[PDB]
């Protein structure tokens, strides 16, 4: 996260760290959606252009974390993966369309003050909240700058951007399964996700029921926090049919 701030304790209890077993390193962010399911970006698990194709055994998920590098004894829980599910129409060849994946845990994780699931949006909550100008929140342990690393989880609030502006900021083909967020130049405020934050959540707090909903997944950007550029997020509600199908069939 660029131009963010330290998260408060328990501020993002659904935050998950995708962790490579060997060598031990941060792979991506992710989120807890139930006691057995974790949501992330498909590109965190499968990206042939960079020879990335992780299997269940290559990875762990660390839940309830705050410190980036520290083993948080009596706080974090480390879970093994039972199965990875990648959207069948994830477009890794072109533009990361449908950049979404689910990971089923071997055993349910115990909820605590630091571990708790985020809600997934229904049609109405998406319609009401996914509007240009409305701010969401992005969290992660990724780079503090494009060109270093945080001691603890970082947080930044960013406004959703009008679709024409998103499209005009890039040469990449933008789809209905993506939305973009961030401040416009000279707007006085900055901030963005960066390498290591991808797969993590873009959340909004419903003013109707005071619950946090995950509206996006940190998907891609051209650099981090560049003027005139915006971060792009997987549109969670647009892909909920697939999410439900996987959970209904394999849950």
């Amino acid at each position: 996260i660029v131009e963010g701030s330290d998260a408060e304790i328990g501020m993002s209890p659904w935050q998950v760290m995708l962790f490579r077993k060997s060598p031990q390193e941060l792979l991506c962010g992710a989120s807890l959606i139930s006691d057995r399911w974790v949501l992330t970006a498909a590109h965190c698990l499968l990206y042939p252009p960079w020879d990335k194709n992780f299997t269940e055994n290559d990875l762990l998920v660390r839940i309830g974390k705050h410190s980036r590098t520290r083993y948080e004894r009596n706080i974090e829980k480390i879970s093994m993966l039972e199965k990875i599910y990648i959207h069948p129409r994830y477009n890794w060849r072109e533009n990361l369309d449908r950049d979404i994946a689910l990971m089923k845990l071997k055993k349910p994780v115990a909820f605590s003050d630091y571990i708790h699931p985020v809600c997934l949006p229904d049609r109405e909550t998406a319609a009401s909240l996914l509007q240009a100008g409305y701010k969401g929140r992005v969290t992660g342990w990724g780079n503090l700058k494009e060109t270093g690393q945080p001691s603890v989880l970082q947080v930044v609030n960013l406004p959703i951007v009008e679709r024409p502006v998103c499209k005009d900021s890039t040469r990449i083909r933008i789809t209905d399964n993506m939305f973009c967020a961030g401040y416009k130049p000279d707007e006085g405020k900055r901030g963005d996700a960066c390498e290591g934050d991808s797969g993590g959540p873009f959340v909004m707090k419903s003013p109707f029921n005071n619950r946090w909903y995950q509206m996006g997944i940190v998907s891609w950007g051209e650099g981090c926090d560049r003027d005139g550029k915006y971060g792009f997020y997987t549109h969670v509600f647009r892909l909920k049919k697939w999410i439900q199908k996987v959970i209904d069939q394999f849950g």
Partner: peptide
């Protein structure tokens, strides 16, 4: 059933330092 309600915030009726920024942006 309890999704999106944080034990250290919503569950105890405490607000985090910047959530108000989100609420203030929900103008429509």
């Amino acid at each position: 059933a309890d999704c999106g309600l944080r034990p250290l915030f919503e569950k105890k009726s405490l607000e985090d330092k910047t959530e108000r920024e989100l609420l203030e942006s929900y103008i429509d």
